[PDB]
Structure 1
């Protein structure tokens, strides 16, 4: 299990021709001030490693869900 931080790297990983499954997990964490925000984890199942991109911006998360390839088995929740 590895964590990634580059959106471009994550999009490249989503098309690596061995990634056939991803999952989108929604967490309800607090942003160090008590405000309940929405954290989105994108987990792409590589052949050897599970790559996780953590996005604390719900808007960028929605944009990434829209930009995910349509043959990825996105597995919301």
Structure 2
């Protein structure tokens, strides 16, 4: 039910006690007027709401995923 943009805040969520699972979605999407680009939504299933953080920059996306806690049960796709 929540969207999130502070990439710092996000991280802190995923290390909260109640957070057992997560999921990464990937969408094809097109930019501005012309070409496409790879959108990636990071979803953290909290106890009472699903936080989802969108990273348009596919770059930011990769070296985000390797930040993800080694203990979190991530759902890929």
Which TM-score tier does this pair reach, normalised by the shorter chain?
over 0.9
C-alpha deviations, 1:11-36, integer Å up to 9, x for none? 00000110110000000011122311
Normalised TM-score (structure 2): 0.96
Shift of 1:45: 0.2
C-alpha distance in 2, partners of 1:66/1:33? 31
Shift of 1:59: 1.1
Structure 1: 4+ residue segments shifted above 2 A: none
C-alpha distance in 1, partners of 2:33/2:54? 19
Normalised TM-score (structure 1): 0.96
C-alpha distance in 2, partners of 1:49/1:23? 14
What do you get for the CA RMSD once the two structures are aligned? 0.7
Gaps of 5+ in 2: none
Does the residue aligned with 1:37 lie in a helix, a strand or coil? strand
Q: Judging by fraction of residues, say which structure has more strand.
A: 2
Shift of 1:40: 0.3
- Count of residue pairs the alignment pairs up: 77
Aligned counterparts, 1:1-77, within 5 A: 1-77=1-77
